[PDB]
Amino acid sequence: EGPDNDERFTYDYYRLRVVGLIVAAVLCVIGIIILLAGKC
Amino acid sequence: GWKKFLWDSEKKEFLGRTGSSWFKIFLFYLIFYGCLAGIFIGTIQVLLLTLSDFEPKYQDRVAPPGLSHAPYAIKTEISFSISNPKSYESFVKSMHKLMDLYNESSQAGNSPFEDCSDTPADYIKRGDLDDSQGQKKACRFSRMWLKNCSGLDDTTYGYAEGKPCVVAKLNRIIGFYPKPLKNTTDLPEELQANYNQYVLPLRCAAKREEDREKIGSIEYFGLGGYAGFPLQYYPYYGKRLQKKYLQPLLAIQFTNLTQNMELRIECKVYGENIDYSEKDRFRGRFEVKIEVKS
Amino acid sequence: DLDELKKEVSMDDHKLSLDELHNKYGTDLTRGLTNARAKEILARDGPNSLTPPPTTPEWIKFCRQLFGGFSILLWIGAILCFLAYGIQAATEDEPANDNLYLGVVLSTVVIVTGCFSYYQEAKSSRIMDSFKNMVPQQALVIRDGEKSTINAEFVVAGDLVEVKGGDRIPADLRIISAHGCKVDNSSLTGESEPQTRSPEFSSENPLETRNIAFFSTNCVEGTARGVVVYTGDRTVMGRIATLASGLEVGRTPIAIEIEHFIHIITGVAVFLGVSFFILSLILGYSWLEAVIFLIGIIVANVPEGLLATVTVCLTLTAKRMARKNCLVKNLEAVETLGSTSTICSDKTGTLTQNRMTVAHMWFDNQIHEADTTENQSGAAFDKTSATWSALSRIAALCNRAVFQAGQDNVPILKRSVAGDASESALLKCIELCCGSVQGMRDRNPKIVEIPFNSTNKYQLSIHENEKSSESRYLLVMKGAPERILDRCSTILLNGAEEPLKEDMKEAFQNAYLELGGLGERVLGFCHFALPEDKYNEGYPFDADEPNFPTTDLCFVGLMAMIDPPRAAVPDAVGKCRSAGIKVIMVTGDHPITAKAIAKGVGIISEGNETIEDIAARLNIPIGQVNPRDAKACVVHGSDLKDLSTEVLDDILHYHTEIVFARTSPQQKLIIVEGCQRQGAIVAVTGDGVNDSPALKKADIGVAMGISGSDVSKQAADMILLDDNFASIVTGVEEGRLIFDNLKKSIAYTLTSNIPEITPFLVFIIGNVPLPLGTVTILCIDLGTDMVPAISLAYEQAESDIMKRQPRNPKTDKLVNERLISMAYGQIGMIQALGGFFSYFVILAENGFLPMDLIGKRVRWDDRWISDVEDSFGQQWTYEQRKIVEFTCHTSFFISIVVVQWADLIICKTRRNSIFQQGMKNKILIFGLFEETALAAFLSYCPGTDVALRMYPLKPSWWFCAFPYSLIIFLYDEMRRFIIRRSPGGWVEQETYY
C-alpha cells in the first residue's frame, strides 16, 4: 500500500445496482406467480 | 356532553376515568417507553463498538477534494466600495478568522510542531494510523509566507485600495496523497513553466472569453513562491492522531481589476487524483464574482 | 308542494250518488261528454300523465363526487400547501418547491377518487336504465254517445270510460255500472285477491269501497263503466309518488363514522401544531418560520392514501353482491345492512309470491299437502290411489280456464292463464302432476255445463266417459263444501264407495275447519255416473229443467288454495332473527291472513300468543287480561290511526313480535319513523308503490326486481334483481365483514403516520439533519402502502359473525381511542425508533458520529459553507453532505417498509393468532412482495438520484430495521394472547380496537 492506496476511495456501485435490480425483478416475478397460482 | 365528559360528581370521574385509572395508564406508558429507550441505547452502543477511532470506514463520498477560500461570500460574489469602510468588513472578519489560526505564538516548541523544508519537498510518513507512537508531528506553516495578504502589514488585506486577496485551501482528507501531473507532452498550457514535482498547481482564469481582457494580473503567493501546495504537508492523519495540524494555504491577489463591473473568476487545481464535477461547483475548482465598485 | 297536506290520509267523495257525481263534475251517464267540452277540459287542467322525475346532469353528480367529507379535508390540505408556498416565495430567495409538488399531488388524488366513484355509480345507473319498459297505452272513452280508443294522455275528468278484463284502469274512476268486474289492488292497496268492483258503496274508507277504480290497477275479469273522478298527478298514486320524491335522503352510518374519524384526526393535528408553535416561539425562531412549521405539521397529519383505500374496499364488497344479483345504486349502502337491527317487511310481493296455489287437499279421510314452491323442490303427495285420479278428472274437466296461446316455453307455474285465480291454480296443479290437461279435456267431450250462479254457488257439467267399455255419462260439480256436502250420500274411499254416515261427516267438518283455520280457501269436488238406462247416449240434457240428480252425488274430496311464500323466506327470517335483528311485519292486508303468514315465516314464533288468543283460550273478555303477558301483537290500521306517539313507542318497546295489518302507506312511514325515534337502524323491504314512502325514509330500502314497482324501484337504495330473499342475509353478513376489515385497514394506514412526523419534530427540537424527505413520504403514503391496505379487505372472519349481537351505535364506534393508542402510541413509536436507528447508522459509518450531529443544521443547511468538519476532522463540501442526507432518506423509507411487514402481519388479525387463522390471503403475500420490489427498484434504478433524489444503499444497511420488526411481531403476538386468556381484562378495555 502507501502512496498508491487509491482503492481505499473506490466503491463498485455499478455491480451493486445490477445485483439489486436482478433481485428486485426476481421478487416481482415470484409475487406474480403466487398471485396467479390458482387461476389455472 | 361538554361539561359531563369533563367532570361528573356521581362517579367522581375526570375526563372519563377515576383517580386510579390515570395512574395505571401513566405507569404502563412509563415502563413501556423506558424499555424502548433502553433497547435503542443498547443497539446504539453495539454500533459505537463497531467503529474505529482513527479512521472512517467509508471514504468514497469525499474522494475528490474540494477547493474552498477564506472570504465568506453569500452567492460567491465579492462586492464592496473602496470608499465606505463598512462595506468590506464581513470579508476582512472572515479572512482574519482563518489566518488567526496560523499565529506563530500557537506554533512553538518541539512538540508538536516540527521545522520542515523552506522549499517544496516530498511526502512524509509518520508511520501507520495507530496509537503506538504518541501524537504525530505536523509541519509548521508561517503567516509571513503569504507576502502581501497576511494581515500583519495591511490588516485589511487589500480591500482598502481595490486590490483584494483570496486565500485558497484544499479540503483536508485522511490518508490522501496529492499527486501532480507529469512532464509528458500532454499537460495544460499554463502548467509547463515551473514544474516543481513536489507542488500541486493552482491557477485562476476567466469563465468567459470576453472577461479575459478585463481581468488584470493574478499574483499568487505560496510556499517557496510557487502557485501551489507543497506535498510535504500531507498526508493528514486525522484529528485524533494529529491535533494542532495546519494545512497549506495559497494567497491570490487580483491586481489591476477593472472598476464598476462584475468579473467571473474561476480558480482550478490540477492533478491525477483530482476530478471535477458538473454538479458540485466546489470539487477541485471554485468560482468567485468580484466587483470592486467605487 | 305542501307536505302536510300530502302526509294526511286520502279523502274522497265516494259516499255520493250517480246524480250528485254527474252534477258535481258534469257528465251524461248515457252519452258522456262532448268532444269540444272534452278538449276544453284537456287544455284547462292537463294530460292524465304523471310528472317525470327531476333529471340530473352528469357534471352535477361529478361535482358531487369531487366533494364530500374526506375529499374536503384533502382540499383544505392542498390549499394550505399553496399558501405556505406563496409565503416562502415572498419572504425568501431559492424557495424549495416541495410544497407545490405536494399540493398538486393532493389535488390529483382527489380528482382520481372522484372519477372512480362516479364511474361506479354510472355503471349502476346504466344497468338500472335497462329495466324501464314503457309501452304506450290507450283507454276506451265514450263521447257524444260513441266508443273511441284514445291515448291515456288524453283522458280528462268527467268523460265516460269503459274497461274490460285484461286492461288497465286509466285514471281514478267512479264505477257506475259493472258486470262481474274484478280488479287487482295489490300494488296500491296490497290486497292479494281480486276485489269485485260494484257500483254501490260499501265502506267509509275509499280504499275499501267497490265503487272506485284506481290508477295503475288492472281489471282481471269482467267489464265496467265509470266517470273519471281524479286525473293526472292528482290521483292517489300520484300524490304518493309526489310525496316520495318530496322526502329527504338522510346520512348512512358509514358516513357518520368517517366524519367522526376526521374529527379525531383534525383534533390531534391542530393540537400538535399549536403546541409545537408555542414551543418553537419559546426557542427563538421567528414568526415566519413558526407559521410554516404549524402548517407543515397539520398537513403531515393527514392520511392521503386512506381515501383510495376506503373506496376500493367498498367497491370490492359491492362486486360480490353484484355477482349474487344484489345491486346497490350508491356505494356506501353496502354497509348499512350489517348495522341494521330492525327490519320492517312487506307481505304481498315481498314475504309471499302473490300467486294463488293449491296448498292442501282432502281425500280418503286424510289431509294431503302439495308443493307450493316456485322451483318445485319438495315432497309429492302419494299419487297412487284411484281417489286422486277421480279428483284430477273432476278438477281438470269442471274448469273453463286454459293456458294462453304460445306459452310452450315458460314453466308450468309462471305461464299466463286466462280465467279466475281459483280455476288457474287448479289447472296448474293438474297440469303439474297429471300431464297435459288439453288432452285430458279432449279425451272427454263436455256436453252440457252451467256457470257460477250467485244462488247455486256451484259449477256443474256433464261429459262423455272415455272408458272404451263404459259408454255412460259423467257429471261433475264443484263449489262450497257446505252446499256440496248437503248434496251427497256416498264417499269414494280408496276407490270403493261407502255411505255418508255421521262419522265421516264429522271428519269432513274437522277437515273443513282445519283447512279454513290455515287462512286458505277450500272448495269441494264431487261427481256421479249417470245411468245410461234412464239417460241414453242420444238423449240431450238441455240446461232447463232438473235433468240431473242434484242430490245422491259422490263427494270425492276438498281442495284448498292460498298464496304461498317464497322459497328462502322462512330460512332468511330465521337467520335474521338469529343475528338479533327484530323482524316486524308491516302490510296493508287483512289481519287474518297477515297473522297466518307471520306464523308461517317466523315473525310470530310458534308458541307466543296475543291478547285475543288468551281471551279465547280462557273464555273471558279481552279487557280483563294484562297486555304484558302477550309477547306478540297484531295492530290494526284502523286502531293505528287513533294512537299517540307514546303509545307507538310502548308498542315497539314491549312487544317483540309485532304485525301491523291494514296499514296505509302513510302509516307505514309513521311506523318507520317510530322505529327510528328510539335509535335503531331500519331496513324496509318492499315491492309495490305503497312501500315507496317507507323505502325512502328508512335507513336502507330493499326493492324487489321482478315483482317490484317502478316508483319503489327508483326510490329504493338496493335492488334484488333475482327476487331472492336470502340476499338480505348475505348482505347483513358482508356489511359486518367489511366493517371489521375497515377497522384493520385504518389501523394499518395510521400506524405509519408517526415515523413520518417524528423526524421533522426532532429536526426542529434537536437541530439534526432532516431525516425523512418529502418525496419519500410521498413514495410511502401513495405507493407501497396502497396494496397492503387494499389487501386487508380480503380477510375472512375470525369467529362466527352471524352469531354476535348487532353493534351498538352509541357506544361501539369505528375509530375509538383504543386504536389511536396502538397506531400512534405503541407500533408507530417502534417504527420511528427503527428509522432513526438506520439514520444514525448511515451517518456514523460515513464520519458523522451522533455526538457531533446535535447543533449542525445551521451549517449543515448553509449553501455557502464548503468546509464542514466531521467527527474525524475531514472537510465536507455542501453537495457531498447533501448526498449523504439523501441516502439517509432512502434508507429511512426502506426501514419504514421493513417495519410495515410486521405491521401488516399484526394487523391481519385483531384477536386470533397468526398460527390459527393462517396466511391463506394470497393478496397480502403479493402485497408484501410488491412492497419490497418497489423499494428496491426506486433505489437501484439509474437516474433516480437525479429525478427523485434517491441514492443506492449498501447491502449492510438493509438489515438495520429487522430487529425492530421482529420485536413488533412478538409484542403484538403476546398482546393478542392475554385478550384471549383473560376476557374483559385490562388489555381488552385498553388495546382491543
Ligand SMILES: *[C@@H]1O[C@H](CO[C@@H]2O[C@@H](C)[C@@H](O)[C@@H](O)[C@@H]2O)[C@@H](O[C@@H]2O[C@H](CO)[C@@H](O[C@@H]3O[C@H](CO[C@H]4O[C@H](CO)[C@@H](O)[C@H](O)[C@@H]4O)[C@@H](O)[C@H](O[C@H]4O[C@H](CO)[C@@H](O)[C@H](O)[C@@H]4O)[C@@H]3O)[C@H](O)[C@H]2NC(C)=O)[C@H](O)[C@H]1NC(C)=O
Ligand atoms: C493572532 O495575532 C493577532 C495580531 O497579533 C498582533 O501582531 C502580531 C504580529 C504580534 O505583534 C502580536 O503581539 C500583536 O498583538 C491577534 O489580534 C490582535 O489582538 C490585539 C489584542 O486585543 C488587538 O489589539 C487591540 O486593537 C484595538 C483596535 O483594533 C483596531 O484594528 C483592528 C485590526 O487590527 C480592527 O479589527 C479593530 O476593529 C480596530 O479597528 C484596540 O482598541 C485595543 O485596545 C486595547 O488595548 C489598549 C492598549 O493597547 C487598551 O488601552 C484598551 O483598553 C484595550 O484593552 C487593542 O489594542 C489587535 O487589534 C488584534 N489584531 C487584529 C489584526 O485583529 C490575535 O488575537 C492573535 N490570535 C491568537 C489566537 O493568537
Ligand SMILES: CCCCCCCC/C=C\CCCCCCCC(=O)OC[C@H](COP(=O)(O)OCC[N+](C)(C)C)OC(=O)CCCCCCC/C=C\CCCCCCCC
Ligand atoms: C418463507 C419466506 C421465504 C422468503 C424468501 C425470499 C427470497 C430471498 C431472495 C434473495 C436473497 C438472497 C440474496 C443473495 C444475494 C447475494 C449477492 C452477493 O454477492 O452479495 C454480496 C454481499 C456482500 O456485500 P459487501 O458489501 O460485503 O461487498 C461489496 C463488494 N463490492 C461492492 C465491491 C462489489 O452480501 C450480501 O448482500 C448478503 C445477502 C443477504 C444474505 C441472505 C441472508 C438470509 C437471511 C435469513 C434466511 C435464513 C434461512 C435459513 C433456512 C431455514 C430453513 C428452515
Ligand SMILES: CCCCCCCC/C=C\CCCCCCCC(=O)OC[C@H](COP(=O)(O)OCC[N+](C)(C)C)OC(=O)CCCCCCC/C=C\CCCCCCCC
Ligand atoms: C411475467 C414475467 C415478467 C418478467 C419480467 C422480467 C423483466 C427483466 C428483469 C430484470 C432486468 C434487469 C436489467 C438490468 C439493468 C442493469 C442496468 C445497470 O446496471 O445500469 C447501471 C449503469 C449506471 O451506473 P452509474 O455508473 O451511473 O452509477 C452511478 C455512479 N455514481 C453515482 C457513483 C457516479 O447503467 C448505465 O450506465 C446505462 C443504463 C441504461 C438504462 C438501463 C435501464 C434499466 C432500468 C430498468 C430495468 C430494470 C427493471 C427490472 C424489473 C423490476 C420490476 C419492478
Ligand SMILES: CCCCCCCC/C=C\CCCCCCCC(=O)OC[C@H](COP(=O)(O)OCC[N+](C)(C)C)OC(=O)CCCCCCC/C=C\CCCCCCCC
Ligand atoms: C419532538 C417530540 C415528538 C412529539 C411527537 C408527539 C406525537 C403525538 C402522538 C399522539 C397524539 C396524542 C394526542 C392525544 C390523543 C388522545 C386521543 C383522543 O382524544 O381520542 C378521542 C377520545 C374519544 O374516544 P371515544 O369516541 O371512544 O369516546 C366515547 C365516549 N362515550 C361513548 C362515553 C360518549 O377522547 C378521549 O379519549 C378523552 C380525551 C383524553 C385526553 C387525554 C390527554 C392526554 C394528553 C397528554 C398527557 C401528557 C401528560 C404527561 C405527564 C404524565 C405524568 C408524569
Ligand SMILES: CCCCCCCC/C=C\CCCCCCCC(=O)OC[C@H](COP(=O)(O)OCC[N+](C)(C)C)OC(=O)CCCCCCC/C=C\CCCCCCCC
Ligand atoms: C429477523 C427477521 C424479522 C422479520 C420480522 C417480520 C416477519 C414478517 C414476514 C413473515 C412472517 C411469517 C410468519 C409465519 C407464520 C406461519 C403460520 C402458519 O404456517 O400457520 C399454519 C396455517 C394454519 O393452517 P390450518 O390448520 O388453519 O389449515 C386447515 C386446512 N383445512 C381446513 C383443510 C383443514 O396454515 C396456513 O396458513 C396455510 C399455509 C400457508 C403457508 C404460508 C407460507 C408463507 C409465509 C410467509 C410468506 C413470506 C413473506 C415474506 C415477505 C418478504 C418479501 C421480500
Ligand SMILES: CCCCCCCC/C=C\CCCCCCCC(=O)OC[C@H](COP(=O)(O)OCC[N+](C)(C)C)OC(=O)CCCCCCC/C=C\CCCCCCCC
Ligand atoms: C403487471 C405490470 C408490470 C409492469 C412493471 C413495469 C416496471 C417498469 C420497469 C422499468 C422501467 C422504469 C423506467 C425506466 C427509466 C430509465 C431511465 C434511464 O435509463 O436513465 C438513464 C439516464 C442516466 O444517464 P447518466 O448516467 O449519463 O446520467 C448522469 C447524470 N449526472 C452525471 C449529471 C448525475 O437518465 C437520465 O439522464 C435522465 C433520467 C430520467 C429519469 C427517469 C426516471 C423516471 C422517474 C419516475 C418514474 C418512476 C415511477 C415508478 C413507477 C413504478 C412502476 C411499477
Ligand SMILES: CCCCCCCC/C=C\CCCCCCCC(=O)OC[C@H](COP(=O)(O)OCC[N+](C)(C)C)OC(=O)CCCCCCC/C=C\CCCCCCCC
Ligand atoms: C401503482 C404503484 C405506483 C408506484 C409509483 C410511486 C408513486 C410516486 C408518488 C409521488 C412521487 C411524485 C413526486 C414528483 C416529484 C417531482 C420532482 C421534481 O419535479 O423535481 C424537480 C427537478 C429539479 O431539481 P433541482 O432543482 O435539483 O435541479 C437543479 C438543476 N440545475 C442545478 C442543474 C440547474 O427537476 C427534475 O428532477 C427533472 C426531471 C423530472 C422528473 C419528473 C419525475 C416525475 C416522477 C413521478 C410522476 C408520475 C407519478 C405518477 C404515478 C402515480 C402512482 C399512483
Ligand SMILES: CCCCCCCC/C=C\CCCCCCCC(=O)OC[C@H](COP(=O)(O)OCC[N+](C)(C)C)OC(=O)CCCCCCC/C=C\CCCCCCCC
Ligand atoms: C425496540 C422495541 C422494543 C419494544 C419492547 C416493549 C417491551 C415492553 C412490553 C411490556 C411492558 C409493559 C408492562 C406494564 C406492566 C404494568 C401495567 C399494569 O399496571 O397492569 C395492571 C394490570 C392488572 O390489573 P387488573 O387487570 O387485574 O385490574 C382490572 C382493572 N380494569 C377493570 C381496569 C381492567 O395488569 C394486567 O392486567 C397484566 C397485563 C400486563 C401487560 C402484558 C403486556 C406484555 C406485552 C409485551 C411483552 C413481550 C415483550 C417481547 C419482547 C421481545 C424482545 C426481543
Ligand SMILES: C[C@@H]1O[C@@H](O[C@H]2C[C@@H](O)[C@]3(CO)[C@H]4[C@H](O)C[C@]5(C)[C@@H](C6=CC(=O)OC6)CC[C@]5(O)[C@@H]4CC[C@]3(O)C2)[C@H](O)[C@H](O)[C@H]1O
Ligand atoms: C428552518 C428552515 O429549515 C428549512 O425549511 C424547513 C421548512 C420547509 O422549508 C420544508 C420545505 O418547504 C418542509 C415543509 O414545510 C414541511 C414538509 C413538507 C413536512 C411534510 C411532509 C408531509 O408529508 O406533509 C408535510 C415535513 C418536512 C417537509 O417535508 C419539508 C422539509 C424541507 C423544508 O425545507 C424544511 C430551510 O433550510 C429554511 O431555509 C429554514 O429557515
Ligand SMILES: *[C@@H]1O[C@H](CO)[C@@H](O[C@@H]2O[C@H](CO)[C@@H](O)[C@H](O)[C@H]2NC(C)=O)[C@H](O)[C@H]1NC(C)=O
Ligand atoms: C493595468 O490596466 C491598465 C488599464 O486599465 C493598463 O494601463 C493602460 O495602458 C494603455 C496602453 O495599453 C493606456 O492607453 C491606458 O491609458 C492605461 N491606463 C492606465 C489607467 O494606466 C496597465 O498597463 C495595466 N497594468 C498591468 C500590470 O496589467
Ligand SMILES: CC(C)CCC[C@@H](C)[C@H]1CC[C@H]2[C@@H]3CC=C4C[C@@H](O)CC[C@]4(C)[C@H]3CC[C@]12C
Ligand atoms: C421471509 C423473510 C424473513 C425474508 C427476509 C428477506 C430479507 C432479509 C431480504 C429481502 C430483500 C433482500 C435484500 C434486497 C436487495 C439487496 C441488494 C442486492 O444487490 C444484495 C442483497 C440485498 C442487500 C438483499 C438482502 C436480504 C433482503 C433484505
Ligand SMILES: CC(C)CCC[C@@H](C)[C@H]1CC[C@H]2[C@@H]3CC=C4C[C@@H](O)CC[C@]4(C)[C@H]3CC[C@]12C
Ligand atoms: C430487555 C431490555 C428492556 C433491557 C434494556 C437494558 C438497558 C437499560 C441497558 C442495555 C445496554 C445498557 C447500556 C449499554 C452501555 C453502556 C455504557 C457503559 O459504559 C455504561 C452503561 C451503559 C450506559 C448501559 C446503560 C443501560 C443499558 C441501556
Ligand SMILES: CC(C)CCC[C@@H](C)[C@H]1CC[C@H]2[C@@H]3CC=C4C[C@@H](O)CC[C@]4(C)[C@H]3CC[C@]12C
Ligand atoms: C435479539 C435482539 C435484542 C438483538 C438485537 C441485535 C442488534 C444489537 C444488532 C441487530 C442488527 C445489528 C446492526 C445491523 C447493521 C449494522 C451495519 C454494519 O455495517 C455494522 C454493524 C451494524 C451497526 C449492527 C450493530 C448491531 C445490531 C443493531
Ligand SMILES: CC(C)CCC[C@@H](C)[C@H]1CC[C@H]2[C@@H]3CC=C4C[C@@H](O)CC[C@]4(C)[C@H]3CC[C@]12C
Ligand atoms: C416524543 C415523546 C417524548 C412524546 C411521548 C408522548 C406520549 C407520553 C403520549 C403519546 C400518545 C399518548 C397517549 C395516546 C392515547 C391515549 C388515550 C386517551 O384516551 C388518553 C391519553 C392517552 C393514554 C395518551 C397518553 C400520553 C401518550 C402515550
Ligand SMILES: [Mg+2]
Ligand atoms: Mg307489496
Ligand code: NA
Ligand atoms: Na403522512
